[PDB]
Amino acid sequence: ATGGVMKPHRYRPGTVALREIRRYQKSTELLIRKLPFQRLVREIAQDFKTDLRFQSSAVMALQEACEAYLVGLFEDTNLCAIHAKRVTIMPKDIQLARRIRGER
Amino acid sequence: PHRYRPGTVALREIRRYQKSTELLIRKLPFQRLVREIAQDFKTDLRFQSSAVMALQEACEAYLVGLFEDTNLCAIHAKRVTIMPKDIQLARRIRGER
Amino acid sequence: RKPPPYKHIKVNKPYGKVQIYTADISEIPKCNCKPTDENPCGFDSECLNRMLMFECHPQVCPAGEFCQNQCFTKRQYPETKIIKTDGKGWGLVAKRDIRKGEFVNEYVGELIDKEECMARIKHAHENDITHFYMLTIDKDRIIDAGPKGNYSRFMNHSCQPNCETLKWTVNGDTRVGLFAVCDIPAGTELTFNYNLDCLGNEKTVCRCGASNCSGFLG
Amino acid sequence: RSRKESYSIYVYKVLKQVHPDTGISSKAMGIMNSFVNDIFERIAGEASRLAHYNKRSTITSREIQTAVRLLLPGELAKHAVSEGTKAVTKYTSA
Amino acid sequence: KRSRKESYSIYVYKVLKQVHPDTGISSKAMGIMNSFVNDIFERIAGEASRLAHYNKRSTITSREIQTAVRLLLPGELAKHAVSEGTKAVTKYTSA
Amino acid sequence: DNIQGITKPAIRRLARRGGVKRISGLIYEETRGVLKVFLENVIRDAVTYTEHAKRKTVTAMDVVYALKRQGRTLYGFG
Amino acid sequence: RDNIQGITKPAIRRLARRGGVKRISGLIYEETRGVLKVFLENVIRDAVTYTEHAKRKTVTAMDVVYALKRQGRTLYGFG
Amino acid sequence: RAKAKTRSSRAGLQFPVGRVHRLLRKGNYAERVGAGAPVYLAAVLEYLTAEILELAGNAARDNKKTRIIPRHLQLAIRNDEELNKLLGKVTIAQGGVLPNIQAVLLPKK
Amino acid sequence: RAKAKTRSSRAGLQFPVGRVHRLLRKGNYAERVGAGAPVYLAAVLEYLTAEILELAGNAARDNKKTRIIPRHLQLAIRNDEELNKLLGKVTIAQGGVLPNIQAVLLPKK
DNA sequence: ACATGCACAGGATGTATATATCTGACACGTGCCTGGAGACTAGGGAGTAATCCCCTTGGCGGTTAAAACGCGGGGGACAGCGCGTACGTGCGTTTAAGCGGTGCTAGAGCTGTCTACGACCAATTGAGCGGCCTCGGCACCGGGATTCTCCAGGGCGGCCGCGTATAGGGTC
DNA sequence: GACCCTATACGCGGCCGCCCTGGAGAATCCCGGTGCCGAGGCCGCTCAATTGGTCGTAGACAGCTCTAGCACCGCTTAAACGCACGTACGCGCTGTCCCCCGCGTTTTAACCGCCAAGGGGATTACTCCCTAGTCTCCAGGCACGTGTCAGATATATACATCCTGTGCATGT
Ligand SMILES: Nc1ncnc2c1ncn2[C@@H]1O[C@H](C[C@@H](N)CC[C@H](N)C(=O)O)[C@@H](O)[C@H]1O
Ligand SMILES: [Zn+2]
Ligand SMILES: [Zn+2]
Ligand SMILES: [Zn+2]
């Protein structure tokens, strides 16, 4: 005389992660929100010249470039992690990737 | 019977070759290698001495930079030894093949 | 005598203001298995849909009809029958041996919301209903195999089970399938851990009979 | 309300020549414009350097050919050289 | 017969004697300095050249050279190079 | 604090498209720094171009030129 | 003519030492010979292209310098 | 005159030989431009465009689409070795990436 | 007429404004070269040369040598951050490397 | 005589597909007008020939540094295990992005005008380049002075075994 | 109730890990000669920079239009955020064993120096044809407009398997 729902086993850790990997490697959308990225862009630009204006295509181009940069960087840092016999990427992996690339 | 421990002559050599500014590959072997590589591009080529010297300088600089990146890769994997997979990781991240 | 009558349905039936999320055939995942493979999208192969609890689609899967990963829509339930249990009601026993990992069945019922679920539990308390078939598929969606369901609703809880519930995504929506966790020979009654049943009530005793039985449902 | 030159019509002509029943999106056409301009600039710049290295005032088909060999990788270079030399052979005899 | 090969050797040596009066320079180091000056000249000249083309100009001016300095040089190098070149231009036009 | 607008979910999505399964919790802040560097450089050069044309508005071509100047050619904006 | 074997193991060890490398696996020598041969082939290919464009039968130091520069490995000290 | 005949036609090309000639002249590459240089360059540009467009059309057909979109250009470029090498340092807006998961991240038995 | 006055002397430079002007004119950078462009560029080249040579002379002094050699240019370039950004992709013949050994390779105490 | 086992004509809705309607996305069609094309000329860049005369190639012989080879052994790579916590999965709330619509104005983008800057040319002349010579900075050598590494034996902190002191328990 | 049997931690060295120097080579520096060859300083000349003047057009400057960038507001709702939970992954520790380093001996081939020889790069002199420049003229390509034709797409009507309920055959 109790009732109460049953609960299926949650997905094993790493299954929704792989689902997301496939999903976001299938799509071409922009993965950052647009207003936050635009606010960050204007804030960064305030240091170089005040009262600047931006074309919408300027901010969209910036977002495309930055997102592509971060995706490629994450590919290289995942290679670093896997080299170190891991599957978790850590800040040291980003630092090794950027040092070998030439940025650091 | 006196004998240094395995890793002190290696550090000695590291210091000796990071202090020097000289070519570490022999001259005639590298020159023959360059000529045999160039045979498959055009036959009966000549080579100015400065040409082969510039090639050797560039190749040595390339390999030294590559070994630096390889050493960083090996240290990343918590090793001290460099292995072929380290060269491959360095070249993959650089952009080479 | 016989179990109380229920509309034996075959696919999930929505009810109330619940809403499914069925995607178009273009946006369902496609694996890399090939029709010439040893067992295309087979159980033991490296199917990228099977590994991720995705169900292949014959009109999307590159293996075409050689895809052994359509176990939900084709309903390859191994044959089974219903037997009254000791003090739990009616369980089910299959007709053959089952090797560990064989898709045993699919849980299916009526899709209800949270407030409708608590309404049904209240109505059950009003008439001291003791058999509850709820199973939360997600927030705002619960399966209720009470009125409508299949043979799977006749599997009992056991603290040391031989089957389990796993969520797959078929045609872009979640479905729950009972899988075999150990090599079950026939004659053995099938039972999976409900894995929770206590909402706010007295924790009905668990007469499962397992060695590590928790006594109650928890 | 002013003219804006583009490679769109020529890209579309080449498209109908190889995939007669396939279209192309406006965004993809823009990407093809950028691609043609990029490759044009690469080849023209490399040929311009080639003239200057040899102290010549003229960018000729010979230097465009050599600029193609430097910039294009392998089979692309071979087929581009063949195609261009066929175009120049056909042009000079007409 | 023997053609004249131009180089920045005498100017590099003149600049060296300003900043290190009692210091010489090897022929190989002077060759490296020649390559460095030619490389930097080509970078700035090309950047200002295409910077004029972007704006649909045909004249490479001190504004083009200045902007090519800011694009190519980092931080303090850019600041000091800009100030030095501005000084040389503003003192060139008063003579 | 607009760099905090590059939220954790956004960075996780960018990691997914890069094929990253597990992500250490120290990555996020680190990644923000990386982003804020890259952006800066590009925007710096973009504004430089914008100032040389005597415009108050940063044009998509300024961004494209900055990116190409940095060796990151971008197709699709001019 | 196995001329790539003239880039001997001790030479590779010296190049590794100047790179800071302390201990070296014995499989590094063939890998490094392959890497070196690939790099040399690219540079010599471009240098011979420059040479043939100038109608010359002699590869000059400037051809190598231009090839390196166009591959992004600018080399000071030869012109 | 004699019925102007559009040099691209004389070369058997689709790309504009005359416009390429004008861009070479007004672009400060050398003080003289040969006659066959624009023909050669237009032919090479047309060839490369045809190569990319063919691969992209194949990719767009693999998805059962009849329009080429940036995704298909990206797929064609990254899936072809030499086109990948030519356009390695290039970013295509709205392109995405190749689907690729490392073999160690896949669930094990 | 006036005797002569090289434009470098007018600008107060050691680098040749006239030769830089000719190189700008004969390099196909634009069809016109302003009066102040060679002056500005000669000043900038002179500044960069002076910066590198200052650091290289310091490096030569630190090695008890009174004559700059490629090693000292390399040391000056790699030890300075700005010159290292500028010349990050440049190889210097007979320059060698900085003396760097990673801290993990030093003998354990 | 009768209700158990179980069915068959009608309903009834999922199931499969024809069908009227949107919403763009391009698809031809004008309408211009600007920029290629034809035609012709002038002159300079490039091609060809001849000639010199560096500098690359090839040979020879000796010296000796360096590579090749062998071998012991030390330490690092690498496999295995355990644990504990950090990260992934999911839920319930909250926030802020995105969308749409409105409204205003900075400033991009263009035109018109005119001027003052840069190309161009001729004459002039001094700066910079090739050639040549010398003397000091550096490379090399050699012997002595530190300096650094390595390992063999002593003190210096253990816990550790063993005989031993202290007190509980059974018995007279 | 005291006395003797008996157990159990107490301390008393009892060897031990394990630093700590001390000294022996080995390597590296350091300093004085020594000589040699290249930096650097000068000379002569030539050719490129400077002076001057002319002329044309690039661009600066003003002015105008109207695009598109920004500011704001309200609603929807998806996404972000914070927390709970539980496992699987990172990381530390251990052992083992193999492979690479350090060093000695042998072998080989790089390197150095010297000498020819001839190939081919560099230079010069002509010359001739190919490109810029120009002027005229027309059509190719771009801007804008509207048709057409899809996919998509919600509407709607017939078909296929299931559901029904009282009646057909029957064992009581
Ligand atoms: N192990 C068990 N012991 C006792 N009762 C059980 C057990 N498992 C399930 N039940 C009862 O069965 C209900 C669960 C339902 N899925 C019914 C399953 C049951 N076999 C039936 O179909 O009737 C619960 O309300 C319990 O009262
Ligand atoms: Zn499959
Ligand atoms: Zn399948
Ligand atoms: Zn139990």
Numbering used by the authors:
A (entry chain E): 31 to 134
B (entry chain A): 38 to 134
C (entry chain K): 986 to 1203
D (entry chain D): 31 to 124
E (entry chain H): 30 to 124
F (entry chain F): 24 to 101
G (entry chain B): 23 to 101
H (entry chain C), I (entry chain G): 11 to 119
Text lifted from the article:
NSD2 (also known as WHSC1/MMSET) is a member of the NSD family that catalyzes the mono- and dimethylation of histone H3 K363. Dimethylated histone H3 Lys36 (H3K36me2) regulates gene expression, and aberrant H3K36me2 upregulation, resulting from either the overexpression or point mutation of the dimethyltransferase NSD2, is found in various cancers. NSD2 exhibits weak and nonspecific lysine methylation activity on histone octamer substrates, whereas it strongly and specifically methylates H3K36 when nucleosomal substrates are used. Here we report the cryo-electron microscopy structure of NSD2 bound to the nucleosome.
We solved a 2.8-Å resolution cryo-electron microscopy (cryo-EM) structure of the complex formed by the catalytic fragment of human NSD2 bearing an E1099K mutation (residues 973–1226, containing the AWS domain, SET domain, and C-terminal basic extension) and a nucleosome in the presence of sinefungin, an analog of S-adenosyl methionine (SAM). To facilitate complex formation, we created an NSD2-H4 fusion protein connected by a 32-residue linker and coexpressed it with H3. Although a single nucleosome should contain two copies of NSD2 (due to the NSD2-H4 fusion used), we observed only one NSD2 molecule engaging with one of the two H3K36M residues; the other molecule may exhibit a random orientation with respect to the nucleosome position. Residues 986–1203 of NSD2 and 31–134 of the engaged H3 are visible in cryo-EM density and have been included in the model coordinates. Moreover, NSD2 interacts with the N-terminal tail of H3, the C-terminal portion of H2A, and DNA at two locations, SHL-1 and the external linker DNA position. Two arginine residues in the first α-helix of H3 (H3R49 and H3R52) make extensive contact with NSD2. In addition, H3Y41 stacks against K1152, which further forms a salt bridge with the phosphate group of nucleosomal DNA at SHL -1.
